[PDB]
Design a binder for this molecule. Structure first.
Ligand SMILES: O=C(O)[C@H](O)[C@H](O)CO
Length: 301
């Protein structure tokens, strides 16, 4: 048997942890034990950028990651990180599972990966330790951690946020020590990382959709037999099913869960106010990634 490694930045008991555990189980079953996959949680093999870099270098075979750091490797994916592009999870999933998403997986080939499938981190929401956020003006002047994503950083600077990019494993301590006022993430991540302990304010801004991607080292993938290549592809699809189911459960439980953990949660956000604030920066995104490409995603089924 060949034993490979896969890593994530969140816990085993999270949407991403159930994803990689399912993937690992399915690889072993479908390859008849020829391959086994050791799982690493909570940044044990580094944050997402470090893990993807390792996969590209070949020091590690696999990673499951949000798209946060992905444009640094594959710039064609940026269009997915545009705020308020996707209406809801059903829209995003349909887009990513259909030809638009499937074509984007192919762009990873030239950068030394096989991208096995798309998965899901979820819609991201603002938290902070200073004040309730009801409109964009409330974001102005907040120091917020961001991922290492240029679309997110430009967008949030558009809200007047003072941005600080950081790898995920450093975020709890930064919030704890007040190095930043806040951050933004899906409810799955806020709950699994226990950010309720260090943030008292949450607003369901849902300001961007955060995909996850399964990446494998291209050379490692290419040396698999044809049948085993298919086993890895199918194991990733099963991992995605588990992943998405967990996101749906976490989004359903999340507001109540966090209220019980002491957060003040603002659950009825008027997103149009935030769209209006972003209009100038959004115009630039549309010009960079192409209005035709944006509208194709918007109008997809
Ligand atoms: O905030 C982040 O960096 C990501 O959402 C997290 O690592 C899970 O993918």
């Amino acid at each position: 048997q060949t034993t490979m490694k896969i890593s994530i930045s969140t816990s085993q008991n999270s949407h991403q942890g159930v994803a990689i555990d399912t993937f690992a189980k399915e690889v072993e079953k479908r390859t008849g034990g020829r391959y086994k996959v050791q799982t690493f949680y909570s940044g044990a093999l580094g944050g997402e950028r470090e893990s993807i870099e390792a996969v590209q270098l070949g020091t590690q075979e696999l990673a499951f990651s949000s798209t946060g750091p992905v444009p640094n490797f594959v710039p064609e994916t940026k269009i997915l990180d545009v705020p308020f592009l996707f209406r809801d999870k059903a829209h995003a999933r349909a887009v990513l599972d259909g030809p638009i998403g499937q074509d984007l997986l192919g762009k990873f080939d030239a950068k030394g990966f096989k991208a096995l499938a798309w998965g899901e981190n979820g819609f991201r929401h603002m938290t902070n330790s200073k004040r309730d956020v009801k409109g964009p003006e409330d974001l102005k002047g907040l120091k917020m951690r961001t991922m290492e994503n240029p679309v997110h950083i430009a967008a949030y600077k558009g809200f007047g946020i003072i941005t600080t990019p950081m790898a995920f494993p450093e975020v709890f301590t930064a919030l704890q020590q007040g190095t930043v006022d806040g951050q933004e993430n899906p409810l799955s991540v806020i709950i699994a990382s226990k950010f309720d302990q260090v943030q008292k304010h949450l607003s369901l801004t849902g300001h961007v959709y955060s995909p996850c991607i399964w990446v494998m080292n291209k050379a490692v993938f290419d040396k698999l037999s044809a049948a085993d290549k298919q086993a890895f592809l199918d194991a990733a699809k099963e991992g995605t099913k588990a992943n998405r189911a967990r996101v749906d459960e976490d989004d359903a439980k999340g507001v109540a869960d966090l209220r019980a953990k002491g957060m003040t949660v603002i659950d009825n956000i008027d997103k149009s106010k935030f769209v209006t604030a972003l209009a100038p920066v959004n115009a630039e995104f549309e010009k960079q990634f192409g209005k035709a490409n944006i509208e194709k995603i918007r109008n997809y089924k």
